[PDB]
Amino acid sequence: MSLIDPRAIIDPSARLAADVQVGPWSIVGAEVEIGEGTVIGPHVVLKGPTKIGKHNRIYQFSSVGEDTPDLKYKGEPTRLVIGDHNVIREGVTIHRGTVQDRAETTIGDHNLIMAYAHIGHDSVIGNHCILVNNTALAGHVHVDDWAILSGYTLVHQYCRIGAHSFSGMGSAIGKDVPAYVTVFGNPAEARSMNFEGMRRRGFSSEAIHALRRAYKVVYRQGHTVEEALAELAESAAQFPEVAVFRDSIQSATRGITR
Amino acid sequence: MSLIDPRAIIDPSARLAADVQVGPWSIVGAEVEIGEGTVIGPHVVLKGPTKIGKHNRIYQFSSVGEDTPDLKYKGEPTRLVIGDHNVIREGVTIHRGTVQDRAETTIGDHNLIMAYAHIGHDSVIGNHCILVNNTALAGHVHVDDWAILSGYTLVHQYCRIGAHSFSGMGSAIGKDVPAYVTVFGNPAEARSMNFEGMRRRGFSSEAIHALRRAYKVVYRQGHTVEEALAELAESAAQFPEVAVFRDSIQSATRGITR
Amino acid sequence: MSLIDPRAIIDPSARLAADVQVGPWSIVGAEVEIGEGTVIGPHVVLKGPTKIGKHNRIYQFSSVGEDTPDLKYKGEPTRLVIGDHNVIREGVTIHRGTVQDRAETTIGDHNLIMAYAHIGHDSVIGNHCILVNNTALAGHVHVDDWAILSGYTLVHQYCRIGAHSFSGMGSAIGKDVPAYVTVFGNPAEARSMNFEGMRRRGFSSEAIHALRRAYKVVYRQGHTVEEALAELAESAAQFPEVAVFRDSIQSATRGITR
Numbered sequence: 139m140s141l142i143d144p145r146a147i148i149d150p151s152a153r154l155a156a157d158v159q160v161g162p163w164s165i166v167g168a169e170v171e172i173g174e175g176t177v178i179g180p181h182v183v184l185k186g187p188t189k190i191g192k193h194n195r196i197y198q199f200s201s202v203g204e205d206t207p208d209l210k211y212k213g214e215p216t217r218l219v220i221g222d223h224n225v226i227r228e229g230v231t232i233h234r235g236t237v238q239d240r241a242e243t244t245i246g247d248h249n250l251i252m253a254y255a256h257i258g259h260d261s262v263i264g265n266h267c268i269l270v271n272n273t274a275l276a277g278h279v280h281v282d283d284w285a286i287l288s289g290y291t292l293v294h295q296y297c298r299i300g301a302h303s304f305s306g307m308g309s310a311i312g313k314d315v316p317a318y319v320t321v322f323g324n325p326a327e328a329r330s331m332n333f334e335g336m337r338r339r340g341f342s343s344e345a346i347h348a349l350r351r352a353y354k355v356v357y358r359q360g361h362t363v364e365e366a367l368a369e370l371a372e373s374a375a376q377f378p379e380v381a382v383f384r385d386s387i388q389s390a391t392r393g394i395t396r
Numbered sequence: 397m398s399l400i401d402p403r404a405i406i407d408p409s410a411r412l413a414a415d416v417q418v419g420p421w422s423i424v425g426a427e428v429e430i431g432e433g434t435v436i437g438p439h440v441v442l443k444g445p446t447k448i449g450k451h452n453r454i455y456q457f458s459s460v461g462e463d464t465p466d467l468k469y470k471g472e473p474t475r476l477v478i479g480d481h482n483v484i485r486e487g488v489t490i491h492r493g494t495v496q497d498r499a500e501t502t503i504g505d506h507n508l509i510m511a512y513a514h515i516g517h518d519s520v521i522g523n524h525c526i527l528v529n530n531t532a533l534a535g536h537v538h539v540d541d542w543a544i545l546s547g548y549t550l551v552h553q554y555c556r557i558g559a560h561s562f563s564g565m566g567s568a569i570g571k572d573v574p575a576y577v578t579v580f581g582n583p584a585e586a587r588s589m590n591f592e593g594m595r596r597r598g599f600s601s602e603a604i605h606a607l608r609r610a611y612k613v614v615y616r617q618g619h620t621v622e623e624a625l626a627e628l629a630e631s632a633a634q635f636p637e638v639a640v641f642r643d644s645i646q647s648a649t650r651g652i653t654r
Numbered sequence: 655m656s657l658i659d660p661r662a663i664i665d666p667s668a669r670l671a672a673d674v675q676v677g678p679w680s681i682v683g684a685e686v687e688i689g690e691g692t693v694i695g696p697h698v699v700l701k702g703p704t705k706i707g708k709h710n711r712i713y714q715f716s717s718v719g720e721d722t723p724d725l726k727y728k729g730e731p732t733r734l735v736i737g738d739h740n741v742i743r744e745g746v747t748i749h750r751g752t753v754q755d756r757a758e759t760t761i762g763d764h765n766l767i768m769a770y771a772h773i774g775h776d777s778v779i780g781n782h783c784i785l786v787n788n789t790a791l792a793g794h795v796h797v798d799d800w801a802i803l804s805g806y807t808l809v810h811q812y813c814r815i816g817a818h819s820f821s822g823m824g825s826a827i828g829k830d831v832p833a834y835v836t837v838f839g840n841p842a843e844a845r846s847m848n849f850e851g852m853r854r855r856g857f858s859s860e861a862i863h864a865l866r867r868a869y870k871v872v873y874r875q876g877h878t879v880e881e882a883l884a885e886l887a888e889s890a891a892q893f894p895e896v897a898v899f900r901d902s903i904q905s906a907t908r909g910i911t912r
């Protein structure tokens with residue numbers, strides 16, 4: 139069942155651990171590195187400089203490590219990096235960084251990126267994230283761990299999707315989504331916290347209730363942004379889980395000297 | 397002159413009626429059955445167990461019969477079934493069922509499914525439906541006959557699109573769409589009935605007027621849901637066409653004992 | 655370092671200037687003409703009658719010059735035309751015209767059409783336009799020069815996107831967008847003029863201020879449409895830039911005899 143299909147193209151410069159597979163008609167461009175036990179499906183296109191970790195499954199029609207088309211980037215020799223145990227479904231596009239930001243697009247471990255999703259220049263994904271069909275990260279988007287972006291979720295240049303956060307389908311996210319928050323619609327608004335994926339992480343009930351309290355503070359008490367960050371302080375010493383939520387909201391607003 | 401391109405891959409286990417064609421670089425995975433007079437374009441990917449009926453036209457970059465990525469499904473050996481005279485345009489994805497629901501994703505006859513559309517695990521399509529570009533059925537979605545989903549229509553797990561119904565472009569359907577109803581926007585709201593595709597079916601004028609009356613009852617009289625189902629009763633004996641509309645609304649709301 | 659890959663398929667009827675390149679597994683259907691210095695990536699599909707100008711870059715999974723699926727078109731032998739210095743990113747679909755309108759889909763010069771974008775039957779694109787990821791022109795859409803459609807912008811049959819206009823991401827454009835106007839959301843509303851791409855064109859400050867005045871007139875003074883066209887008259891003699899804006903608004907409303 140013999141590993142690297144002969145109908146596939148591998149650059150001499152590319153370099154692949156022993157038990158990597160490549161389906162037919164797939165291209166492994168120059169400067170592409172593929173870690174142990176990874177599988178490249180048929181009709182894939184890898185371009186470098188790109189570093190793909192161990193035990194990844196990448197499917198057909200996927201164009202992983204292409205240049206961003208954005209005119210900003212004029213071909214400077216930037217990187218893409220993918221961790222281990224990731225799944226990249228049919229037709230996904232992942233673009234390498236631009237020198238303008240950190241010169242690298244980056245994906246962690248255990249992520250599920252479903253069909254026709256896009257991950258633009260300089261975006262950065264943590265672990266156990268799910269990007270559903272046609273989710274699109276315009277560029278320099280940071281997605282912290284466990285986040286779930288429902289189908290056709292759109293995320294504007296530079297937004298931070300905090301951890302365990304959740305976008306509903308057709309969400310149009312123009313600004314940061316705090317840890318644990320559920321957001322919906324065009325343009326994205328906050329609704330609740332994601333109690334779902336909190337029970338899934340086996341959070342204590344005190345921690346859940348405390349996170350509801352925390353939501354209520356920010357949003358439904360109309361404190362200012364600053365006013366609420368202040369309130370949470372207590373809540374956040376008490377519960378590392380809340381801490382995260384305060385910390386998300388923190389480094390979204392620095393504001394100016396009024 | 398030559399039917400099945402030599403550059404295409406056909407599993408020994410696959411089985412294809414005499415005058416089937418397959419374009420180059422297309423893969424017909426194991427357990428894939430293709431009925432009389434069907435045409436598979438170039439760069440297609442079929443995976444099984446999948447049964448494709450007669451006189452279908454499937455285009456390039458289409459991944460028909462892949463497993464749903466949803467973690468729910470752990471590889472149990474489920475099915476896809478496609479009827480006759482269907483068209484599947486460029487880049488369509490169709491996923492086979494999960495044992496959790498009916499273990500089968502199902503498509504009827506005479507359907508037009510346009511480019512980059514998605515038909516998730518366990519979805520079920522009738523006949524003469526049109527799914528326009530990038531329409532997406534999250535899973536277990538039933539689309540009854542003649543329905544038209546305009547481009548980039550999104551349909552949440554388990555929703556029923558009643559017959560002759562119509563979604564506008566970028567519709568975000570979170571709940572059932574009754575027979576004949578036009579819905580628009582994010583989130584989808586009702587606007588009118590689809591008089592268009594009623595004239596197309598050559599409905600009697602009494603039947604059209606009766607269907608307007610019926611709409612008005614449900615929606616624009618603010619009867620309850622139950623209250624309206626009651627009203628329609630008369631309307632629905634009188635006109636098989638209305639009957640359908642009542643029947644759609646019926647088995648969307650069972651409610652609980654208050 | 656010999657230009658047309660041997661694993662690619664070229665119709666004898668197709669015709670390609672000397673220094674054209676074609677990547678592997680790409681098909682150049684009959685009646686396809688490709689101008690000097692153009693590059694066709696791997697796994698592309700060209701179909702004709704199609705005329706592609708000079709120095710274009712077309713990427714993988716792109717299906718350029720296929721028939722529109724719309725049932726309106728019954729195979730009449732219509733055309734696609736693409737100018738020079740265009741970029742067509744991964745997975746783009748471009749459909750040839752229908753005899754019903756002008757029998758031709760048309761693209762000018764220096765345009766950037768990003769991944770998974772769609773350009774339906776009879777649409778018409780000027781120069782230096784950017785269509786971002788998954789932008790979709792349903793059909794007979796005219797996009798005048800310098801226009802920018804942010805990602806997942808949807809444009810209903812027959813709309814005119816005036817020059818330097820700008821749609822935000824997930825915009826759902828059901829009606830004309832005047833020159834220079836910024837529109838956002840579902841359904842698209844007007845917000846501002848696109849001062850951005852005005853500074854980019856090096857417009858005089860008088861011209862910018864005059865264009866703000868002009869916006870204010872149409873929209874924020876609630877003159878009628880006709881009433882405002884009247885006002886602009888002066889503004890529009892004075893400034894060719896305004897002229898454009900009046901002219902966009904003009905041939906969107908002919909109205910009827912009341």
Ligand SMILES: Nc1nnc(CN(Cc2ccc(=O)[nH]c2)C(=O)CSc2ccccc2Cl)o1
Pocket residue numbers: 268270271286287288289290306307465466467514516532533534535550551552553
């Ligand atoms: N609101 C809501 N609740 N459950 C869901 C499912 N889901 C998100 C999801 C979560 C986990 C997972 O594995 N897949 C999808 C979606 O994005 C629904 S929309 C969708 C799903 C699959 C394919 C394409 C689309 Cl548009 O949506």
Ligand SMILES: Nc1nnc(CN(Cc2ccc(=O)[nH]c2)C(=O)CSc2ccccc2Cl)o1
Pocket residue numbers: 526528529545546547548564565723724725772774790791792793808809810811
């Ligand atoms: N408002 C409205 N009424 N009819 C239309 C056309 N249509 C629906 C349609 C009708 C017939 C058919 O054969 N295909 C699509 C659309 O989906 C419009 S949006 C669209 C069309 C083609 C590709 C992609 C998109 Cl976003 O738009």
Ligand SMILES: Nc1nnc(CN(Cc2ccc(=O)[nH]c2)C(=O)CSc2ccccc2Cl)o1
Pocket residue numbers: 207208209256258274275276277292293294295784786787802803804805806822823
């Ligand atoms: N409001 C706003 N202003 N600029 C933007 C960014 N932009 C447009 C853009 C403009 C020029 C260019 O070369 N690339 C992107 C977008 O399409 C944002 S959404 C996006 C971008 C790239 C891929 C996919 C998506 Cl959804 O959004």
Ligand SMILES: [Cl-]
Pocket residue numbers: 329330331353354
């Ligand atoms: Cl709440």
Ligand SMILES: [Cl-]
Pocket residue numbers: none
């Ligand atoms: Cl409380």
Ligand SMILES: [Cl-]
Pocket residue numbers: 587588589608611612
């Ligand atoms: Cl009505």
Ligand SMILES: [Cl-]
Pocket residue numbers: none
């Ligand atoms: Cl009446």
Ligand SMILES: [Cl-]
Pocket residue numbers: 612616
């Ligand atoms: Cl009324």
Ligand SMILES: [Cl-]
Pocket residue numbers: 764
């Ligand atoms: Cl020029």
Ligand SMILES: [Cl-]
Pocket residue numbers: none
């Ligand atoms: Cl110019």
Ligand SMILES: [Cl-]
Pocket residue numbers: 764766782783
């Ligand atoms: Cl440009």
Ligand SMILES: [Cl-]
Pocket residue numbers: none
């Ligand atoms: Cl014209």
Ligand SMILES: [Cl-]
Pocket residue numbers: none
């Ligand atoms: Cl002034």
Ligand SMILES: [Cl-]
Pocket residue numbers: 870874
């Ligand atoms: Cl004002």
